Design a protein around this ligand. Sequence first.
Ligand SMILES: O=c1cc[nH]c(=O)[nH]1
Ligand SMILES: O=c1cc[nH]c(=O)[nH]1
Lengths: 201, 202
Amino acid sequence: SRAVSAKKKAILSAALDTFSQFGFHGTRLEQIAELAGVSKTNLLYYFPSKEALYIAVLRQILDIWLAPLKAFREDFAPLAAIKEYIRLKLEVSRDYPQASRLFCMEMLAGAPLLMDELTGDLKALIDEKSALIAGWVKSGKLAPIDPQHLIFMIWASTQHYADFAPQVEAVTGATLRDEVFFNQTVENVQRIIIEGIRPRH
Amino acid sequence: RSRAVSAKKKAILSAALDTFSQFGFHGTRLEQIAELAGVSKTNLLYYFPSKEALYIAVLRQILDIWLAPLKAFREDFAPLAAIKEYIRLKLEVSRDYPQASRLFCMEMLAGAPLLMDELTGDLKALIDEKSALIAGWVKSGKLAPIDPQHLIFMIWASTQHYADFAPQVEAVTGATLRDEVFFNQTVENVQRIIIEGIRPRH
Ligand SMILES: O=c1cc[nH]c(=O)[nH]1
Ligand SMILES: O=c1cc[nH]c(=O)[nH]1
């Protein structure tokens, strides 16, 4: 149904903005229900608790973050695939900083509510894609870097510009919404990581 | 300068770090910091006039630890060797002081309400100075053409990740930086990507 999806997205977006501004414990479901334009009973049909909504919000940003990596295939040009991956991750930092910070804040608390996804569906995908990239490496299409550590570096360097945005602005005077700085950021992150994993000699 | 006094101020700062780490800034009471440091409230207020002053002192101390290697950069150093220590020291700090990494990251997530003066002032000054130093290394052919500030941010981001995102690292790999073998694999992998990413080539 389109209507169910339209409504689930209105709730998730209202939920993101409310968790972002009031934190998990200070947020009440009725407040989210007011801003999505729906009744509490209607909201609870799709998300039975504050915990369910919160987890769903973080699953949504994870699905966005991982889409490029889920699309990886063995016959891709490895360096080209990874440079596109880096570019998509920084567009997410520019456009969805609130969700990036919400995820980072969950990690800082020990991932009390997200540990089910990290040990389950997330670990399954990274195991699968790590084996794929290890194939690219055991075949000389990439230098020898270990796959899980290359992935962590991609995540860390692109999410930095959202999560650490106040420090980036303080040192450079710019943000990712400044077109020129955005393009300089993409090119420089790409240069270091790509040349760092490019086959040699 | 008196060391006993310095030893006492560091004892207080360390009690503050772990109390701020466990209860957050607004939930922390000065009485808790004093009781856990082994000192009277009055002795704490002698050195730190407010909870906000102490909190800022705690975050400045972790900044000083983090930036010491970069302050030590000088034009005549071997660039790649210097950046290899920097990465190694940053990963040692993520292993030994994860609580401080998390507290600083949490300050950034709130918009840096209390620390923004330190970022726009002393931090920006150092990064300007050392970024020009690194631009000199590139204009003298000792490094590939990279932009200095983004190289620095990547050193920070990739090394602090293993502390701030430790639960995700453990979930995906089963390990932490306290495992000697995983620590050494991490150093070698981060160093390899950044160093080979910036090596002159030619
Ligand atoms: O892109 C991603 C995906 C999963 N976890 C992260 O921290 N970043
Ligand atoms: O090492 C450092 C120094 C300043 N700010 C950071 O995030 N990391």
